[PDB]
Amino acid sequence: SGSELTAKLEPAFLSGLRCAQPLIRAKFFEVFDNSMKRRVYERLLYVTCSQNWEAMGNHFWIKQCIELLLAVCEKSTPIGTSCQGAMLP
Amino acid sequence: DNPEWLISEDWALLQAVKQLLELPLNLTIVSPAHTPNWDLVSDVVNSCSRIYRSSKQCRNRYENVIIPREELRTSQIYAQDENATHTQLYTSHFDLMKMTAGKR
């Protein structure tokens, strides 16, 4: 961690994040998720400032932004809505 | 580079690099996401340039002239010129257009 090697392998890591094989993509996102704190502002700052997205190539890396920010959301809360007028009673 | 660079072009180049890219004089990366974009710089310069300056030409000019000059500064030359050179450029173009109109 922090070696020149991890700096040199960034294109490979970004290939893992955009991988078409979901198990690889999940393992790489799990590494990616823990690299920053579970906070909205810090992750928005990450995607604006820290991540060079050039190595993604032609990939629509907004997918990774969605994945990164939605990870902040609370997971154990029961599913629900504000749309009480649309709910089946 | 075949037409000479006006002080207004150099000033637009320097200000584009400083204001828009928010990069320092030596283009050292401050944030990894913020790599230099010489296409944007070429677009800014060409808004007021006397001829199309490519992004490669803008990069070469910046690195080979403005970096040594900032290390009279481009701001000092721009202030001292008082738009005279660029005015004389347009005067010359107006004279050539009047010459062409008269030749009809």
Burial of residue B102 (number of CB atoms within 10 Å: 0-12, 13-18, 19+): exposed
Tell me the nearest-neighbour CA distance from B30 into chain A, angstroms: 9
Q: What tokens does B61 get?
A: 């000019």
Q: One-letter amino acid identity for B103? A: K
Q: One-letter amino acid identity for A71? A: A
Distance, in Å, from the CA atom of A9 to the CA atom of B78, rounded to the nearest integer, reads: 45
Contacts 24+ apart (CB under 8 A), A58-66: A59/A18, A61/A18, A63/A18, A64/A17, A64/A18, A64/A29, A64/A32
Tell me the nearest-neighbour CA distance from B35 into chain A, angstroms: 8
Locate the chain B residue with the closest alpha carbon to A49. B33
Distance, in Å, from the CA atom of B57 to the CA atom of B3, rounded to the nearest integer, reads: 12
∠ CA A62-A67-B37, rounded to 5°: 30
Burial of residue B92 (number of CB atoms within 10 Å: 0-12, 13-18, 19+): exposed
CB-based contact A68:A43 (threshold 8 Å)? yes
Could you say which residues from 12 to 51 on chain A have a Cβ atom under 8 Å away from some Cβ of chain B? 47-51
Q: Assign B92 to helix, strand or coil.
A: helix
